[model samples]
Target: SQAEATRQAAAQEERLADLASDLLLQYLLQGGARQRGLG
Candidate 1:
């Protein structure tokens, strides 16, 4: 039904956001290896 579809969409969006956050955190932690914050 429509409600179920909407709920699934919301769940997918939340999962995507979580995955994005994890990737960003990993990038920040490893960024120094690529001279991302070096002076």
Candidate 2:
């Protein structure tokens, strides 16, 4: 029961972390990298 609860919290937090990182990186890093590289 405790283990299940822990994973539930961890799983939710990790999912959001992964999602935010991905979205930010694509726009923040890739967008800047491509713009800075080409121009």
Candidate 3:
């Protein structure tokens, strides 16, 4: 039971990290485009 819990924790962290990475990339791209439009 403890081992399963540990594995689940690791999986959850990996999933969250992936989600955060994707969101950051999208934000950067959108912001860059907006800045170019303003210029």
Candidate 4:
């Protein structure tokens, strides 16, 4: 049970980080596009 819990927590952490990176990438791309007047 402890091992399972740890695995689940790690998985959740990985997912959260993945989502954060995706959002950051999207924000940067949109910001860059706007700066270039392409947005």
Residue 12 lDDT, candidate 1, scale 0-100: 99
Candidate 4 runs further than 4 Å off = none
For model 4, what is the C-alpha lDDT against the true structure? Answer: 0.92
Candidate 2 clashing pairs, residues 3+ apart or interchain: none
**Residue clash pairs of candidate 1:** none
The ten-residue window of minimal lDDT in model 2 covers: 23-32
Worst-scoring 10-residue span by lDDT in model 1: 30-39
lDDT of candidate 2 at residue 14, scale 0 to 100: 90
Distance (Å) between predicted and true CA of 22, model 2?
A: 0.9
lDDT of 4 by residue, 1-39 (tens): 699999999999999998999989999999988899964
Tens digits of per-residue lDDT for model 1 on 1-39? 699999999999999999999989989888876686575
Local distance difference test values of all predictions, in order: 0.89, 0.90, 0.94, 0.92
lDDT of 2 by residue, 1-39 (tens): 699999999999999998999988889888789889995
Q: TM-scores, in order shown? A: 0.65, 0.49, 0.74, 0.69
State candidate 2's TM-score.
0.49
Error of 1 at 29 (Å): 0.8
Q: How many backbone clashes does candidate 3 have?
A: 0
Question: Judged by lDDT relative to the true structure, which candidate is superior, 1 or 3?
Answer: 3
Candidate 3 C-alpha lDDT tens digits along 1-39: 699999999999999999999989999999989999895
